[PDB]
Amino acid sequence: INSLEELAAQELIAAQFEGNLDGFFCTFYVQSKPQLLDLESECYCMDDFDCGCDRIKREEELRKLIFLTSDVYGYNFEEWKGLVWKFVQNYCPEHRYGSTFGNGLLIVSPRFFMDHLDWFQQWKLVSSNDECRAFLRKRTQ
Amino acid sequence: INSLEELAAQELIAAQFEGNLDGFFCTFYVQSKPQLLDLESECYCMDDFDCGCDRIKREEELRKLIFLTSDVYGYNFEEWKGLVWKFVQNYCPEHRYGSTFGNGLLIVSPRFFMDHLDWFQQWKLVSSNDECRAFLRKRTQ
Numbered sequence: 427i428n429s430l431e432e433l434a435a436q437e438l439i440a441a442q443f444e445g446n447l448d449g450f451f452c453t454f455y456v457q458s459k460p461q462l463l464d465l466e467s468e469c470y471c472m473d474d475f476d477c478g479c480d481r482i483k484r485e486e487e488l489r490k491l492i493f494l495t496s497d498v499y500g501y502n503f504e505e506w507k508g509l510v511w512k513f514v515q516n517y518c519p520e521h522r523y524g525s526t527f528g529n530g531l532l533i534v535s536p537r538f539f540m541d542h543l544d545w546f547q548q549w550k551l552v553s554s555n556d557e558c559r560a561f562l563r564k565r566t567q
Numbered sequence: 568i569n570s571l572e573e574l575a576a577q578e579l580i581a582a583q584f585e586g587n588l589d590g591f592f593c594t595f596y597v598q599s600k601p602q603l604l605d606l607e608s609e610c611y612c613m614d615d616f617d618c619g620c621d622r623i624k625r626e627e628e629l630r631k632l633i634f635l636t637s638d639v640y641g642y643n644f645e646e647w648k649g650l651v652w653k654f655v656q657n658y659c660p661e662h663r664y665g666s667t668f669g670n671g672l673l674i675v676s677p678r679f680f681m682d683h684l685d686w687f688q689q690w691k692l693v694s695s696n697d698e699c700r701a702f703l704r705k706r707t708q
Contacts, residue, residue: 467611470610471608477623482610482619520621
């Protein structure tokens with residue numbers, strides 16, 4: 427049922443989303459049981475200085491919440507979006523020196539992806555920070 | 568022993584620079600023997616997955632080079648500035664609920680400072696990424 431529901435979405439991504447959910451410096455994956463510990467770090471700055479481990483730890487915390495809140499029926503969808511927005515705010519594109527750029531990773535369950543197909547289709551077309559902020563703004567309904 | 572040079576700098580900072588070297592999301596200190604090892608991390612990812620450690624290691628690496636190359640006479644100033652650009656490029660403030668809008672930290676030798684005071688005044692009154700881009704890339708003087 428986990429594979430079975432994951433399979434339909436992965437087939438649906440192939441069919442209608444051209445094999446991917448890449449958006450603006452961020453892509454979504456659709457998995458029933460993600461290996462979230464494989465996406466973590468162990469990070470200490472010594473001698474009490476913000477080296478940037480916090481930024482890392484915050485990113486992991488938010489990816490986790492974005493998944494866990496997606497993996498249940500009926501979570502507040504605007505509050506979910508606000509979490510994505512905080513992730514997006516905290517992301518800082520690892521642009522490999524020259525003119526290269528990379529994508530932040532987020533994960534959502536298959537049930538959630540398939541309750542929100544139109545939304546994930548728009549996600550892919552986001553082209554700026556300014557559009558992104560508008561797209562993720564917490565509407566009432 | 569080598570404080571004499573630092574204090575000559577600290578006196579000029581207080582006297583002629585309003586007591587700081589803050590610029591556009593970044594700050595210079597002037598130190599003869601900085602404790603760069605204090606300003607460090609020991610952190611790793613798990614998977615092949617880039618968890619954001621690479622950006623921190625790069626930051627330290629560049630910070631240290633920025634200091635070491637300032638700590639001798641006659642280094643290629645344009646190339647020195649090139650390191651500063653790569654540092655700024657690789658920097659990003661941590662953002663959660665707008666504020667805070669924080670500063671990166673660089674350190675430079677007393678003598679390097681005292682041979683480029685004029686350049687350091689211009690560094691302060693930068694206030695955009697494009698002003699930063701131009702100021703660092705354009706042949707000085």
